[PDB]
């Protein structure tokens, strides 16, 4: 019995490979060869957000592109006014071992989680003036690696128990659960229209999920090692992932395969975030080598370097209006580049 | 600046609270606590009193010890062990009355984040090991053991087999053998930590 199922799965994979190879009539690097290169992308540290006392692990921008939340293993989640460097809130976490945070698109809420397995939903707009936990979401069998709001009432989380889940923040319960990786779901990103999202897993595959139908819609592979970070191309028809294999890749949703690869012989450190600019033409990738590199996402060559940190960058993020790209690292200073 | 100075007052006030919390927390000593499954960890945690990470803590000779039992994580270490890069020492427990612990030590004590961080090694259940050696020889656990089947030598051989696994030369493995009734564990942890702290200070002074 079982051998037949294994053989049929193998044949299904060979049909996948045949179909994907048949569609590869030309490569992106070949098609876009005639496009003018984006040139030397010079950028300078307009702000430095001093005030964290231990390694920063996450950051996220408000939809207004001005407020930012940054969270570190000191046990504080702080909300910054990026235009003035003022600290708007400081939130004492109930446990110091944070690995992720998010800022709701309305700006009403902030979420956070880590080695606790629990994901906490802070309410920033309380009538009592202070900021308090409106809901503690519990149920994962391992650390929560990454989470994002779809809207104020529902948040999607990604965890070290091979599982992503979608929560109803009112009841505090899993409205849907996404089993299917062979390893940790290390990072996640909801698409621009939030109808579907991707997650990069520690089994080196990245999968495409439907948040209404609850099922895996496509599976992408090609890394040799764990995928530390991922996000969609702003059009929502492509996404790019960064591995501990010291390279980033661009995958296409409709062609079901990798379009281009970003690497250079002098680079051996793993990626820790990979985020596009508002046009999609730049892909900014943060590296364990303390550096951050900006890639021409079409021509696939180095546009420049955002070098300003004394320790690895743990996070990166472009504002919604594209006006700046923050970074945050383990030397406890966030920095705004523009 | 208009009512944009009251906002600046708030900014400075919570900056003050951040620093005041931080300078108070920097007095604590952080200790990652580890071992194989059921390797006696909980007993030294119990001697000191008080599904995710499990922080125990205790206070001794004006130090506050934060003592993280991380083993509740049902996931591979590599993707969260870099949280604990900043601990002062790693406390590693081995049950002599039990060998997976030895491979676990081989794996962690050479890990890229911990080549500079020292290990405190507790060989728990020495009394039960004395009982075991009286009834079944150490060769059952180590077929290459070439020596007398007596506690005072077999136990030291196990200690050597553990201490042989560190390949970086920037650390020391502070051993101890615990009979599980001892109250002295706090003092052992404390003065091992004092040695570790002065060694760190000698490195920070460039004198070492």
């Amino acid at each position: 019995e079982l051998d037949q199922l294994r053989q049929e799965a193998e044949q299904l994979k060979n049909q996948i490979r045949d179909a994907r190879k048949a569609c590869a009539d030309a490569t992106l690097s070949q098609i876009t060869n005639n496009i003018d290169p984006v040139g030397r992308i010079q950028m300078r540290t307009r702000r430095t957000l001093r005030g964290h006392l231990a390694k920063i692990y996450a950051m996220h921008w408000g939809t207004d592109s001005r407020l930012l939340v940054s969270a570190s293993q000191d046990g504080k989640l702080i909300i910054w006014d990026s235009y003035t460097t003022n600290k708007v809130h400081a939130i004492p976490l109930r446990s110091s071992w944070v690995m992720t945070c998010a800022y709701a698109p309305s700006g009403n809420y902030v979420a956070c989680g880590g080695l606790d397995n629990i994901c906490s939903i802070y309410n920033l707009k309380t009538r009592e003036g202070n900021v308090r936990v409106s809901r503690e979401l519990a149920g994962h069998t391992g650390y929560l690696s990454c989470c994002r709001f779809l809207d104020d009432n529902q948040i999607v989380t990604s965890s070290g128990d091979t599982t992503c889940a979608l929560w109803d923040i009112e009841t505090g319960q899993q409205t849907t659960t996404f089993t299917g990786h062979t390893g940790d779901v290390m990072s996640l990103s909801l698409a621009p229209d939030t109808r579907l999202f991707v997650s990069g897993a520690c089994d080196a595959s990245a999968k495409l999920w439907d948040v209404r139908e609850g099922m895996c819609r496509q599976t992408f592979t090609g890394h040799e090692s764990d995928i530390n970070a991922i996000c969609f191309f702003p059009n929502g028809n492509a996404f790019a992932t960064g591995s501990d294999d010291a390279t980033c890749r661009l995958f296409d949703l409709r062609a079901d395969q990798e379009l281009m690869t970003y690497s250079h012989d002098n680079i051996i450190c793993g990626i820790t975030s990979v985020s596009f600019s508002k046009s999609g033409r730049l892909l900014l990738a943060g590296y364990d080598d303390f550096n951050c590199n900006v890639w021409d996402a079409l021509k696939a060559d180095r546009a420049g370097v955002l070098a300003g940190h004394d320790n690895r960058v743990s996070c990166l993020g472009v504002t919604d209006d594209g006006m700046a790209v923050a970074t945050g690292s383990w030397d406890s200073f966030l920095k705004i580049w523009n | 600046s208009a009512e944009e100075r009251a906002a600046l007052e708030r900014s400075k006030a919570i900056e003050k609270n951040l620093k005041e919390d931080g300078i108070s927390a920097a007095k604590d000593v952080k200790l990652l606590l580890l071992g194989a499954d059921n390797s006696g960890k909980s007993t030294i945690v119990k001697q000191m009193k008080i599904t995710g990470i499990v922080e125990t803590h205790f206070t001794f000779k004006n130090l506050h010890f934060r003592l993280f039992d991380v083993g509740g994580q049902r996931s591979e270490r590599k993707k969260w062990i870099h949280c604990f890069e900043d601990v002062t020492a790693i406390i590693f427990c081995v049950d002599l009355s039990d060998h997976e612990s030895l491979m676990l030590f081989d794996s962690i004590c050479n890990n890229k984040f911990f080549i500079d961080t020292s290990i405190i090694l507790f060989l728990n259940k020495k009394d039960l090991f004395g009982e075991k050696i009286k009834k079944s020889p150490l060769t059952i656990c180590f077929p290459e053991y070439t020596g007398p089947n007596t506690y005072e030598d077999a136990a030291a051989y196990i200690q050597a087999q553990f201490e042989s696994k560190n390949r970086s030369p920037n650390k020391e493995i502070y051993c101890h053998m615990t009979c599980a009734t001892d109250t002295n564990n706090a003092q052992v942890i404390f003065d091992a930590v004092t040695d570790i702290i002065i060694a760190n200070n000698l490195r920070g002074c460039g004198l070492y």
Partner: single-chain antibody
Framework: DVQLVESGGGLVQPGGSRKLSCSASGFAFSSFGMHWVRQAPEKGLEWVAYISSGSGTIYYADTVKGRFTISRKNTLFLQMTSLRSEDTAMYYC??????????????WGQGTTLTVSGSDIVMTQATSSVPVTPGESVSISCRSSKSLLHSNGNTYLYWFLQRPGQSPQLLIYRMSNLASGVPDRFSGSGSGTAFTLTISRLEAEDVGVYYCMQHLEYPLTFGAGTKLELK
């Protein structure tokens, strides 16, 4: 729920002294900056004193500096000395908190009646009262001697509604934003130096006196007040 209650009213001998106290509950008082505002027995509001979070800064109105003193156990105090005939008023304890997106002046205590035996930004409201009936739509306007639209882009006009027999409620803040819990019928408008609240589909619940206010700099100036009065 949020609550502020004050005590220490009644008759006082002119030239004497009195301490008025404000007791706060239901909110994180230490993090707010607290104001005092006073209403003369038949007239519009006038600002009295301010004390920030952590008591870092304190300000007083021109006719009050050094005669009163403000201090703040979840309790705030106004210490009054040499009470003049003019110092009789209902005194309101008003909370406020300042940070990006915050809403100052958003809750007002019930207030105590106390009675006794040129560079500042001036502000005017063009109409003393407007006759209006439910289902109609109405407009109330306000002007200032100096422009409120500051370099950082905000324009610091605030609008309050006082229903008869109530402490004022904040309706609009920084000239456009609608205060939480306020019905959507209200809207702010105008820019630079002249401002306008628009009421669409007015209701009997909107009958009252409307005060505009500047917050660009101290001393804070309230408008003379416009009574939107029924029929």
């Amino acid at each position: 729920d949020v609550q502020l209650v004050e005590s220490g009213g009644g008759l006082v001998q002119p030239g004497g002294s009195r301490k008025l106290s404000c007791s706060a509950s239901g909110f994180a008082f230490s993090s707010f900056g607290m104001h005092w505002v006073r209403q003369a027995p038949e007239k519009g509001l006038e600002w009295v004193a301010y004390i920030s979070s952590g008591s870092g800064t304190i300000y007083y109105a021109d006719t009050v500096k050094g005669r009163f003193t403000i201090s703040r156990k979840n309790t705030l105090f106004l210490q009054m000395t040499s009470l003049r005939s003019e110092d009789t008023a209902m005194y309101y304890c008003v909370r406020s908190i300042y940070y990006y997106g915050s809403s100052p002046f958003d809750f007002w205590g019930q207030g105590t009646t106390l009675t006794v035996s040129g560079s500042d930004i001036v502000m005017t409201q063009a109409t003393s009262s407007v006759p209006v009936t439910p289902g109609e739509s109405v407009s109330i306007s306000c002007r200032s001697s100096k422009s409120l639209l500051h370099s950082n882009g905000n324009t610091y006009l605030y609008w309050f509604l006082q229903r008869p027999g109530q402490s004022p409620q904040l309706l609009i803040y920084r000239m456009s934003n609608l205060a939480s819990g306020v019905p959507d019928r209200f809207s702010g408008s105008g820019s630079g130096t002249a401002f306008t609240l628009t009421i669409s589909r007015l209701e009997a619940e909107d009958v009252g006196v409307y005060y505009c206010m500047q917050h660009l700099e101290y001393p804070l100036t309230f408008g003379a007040g416009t009574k939107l009065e029924l029929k």
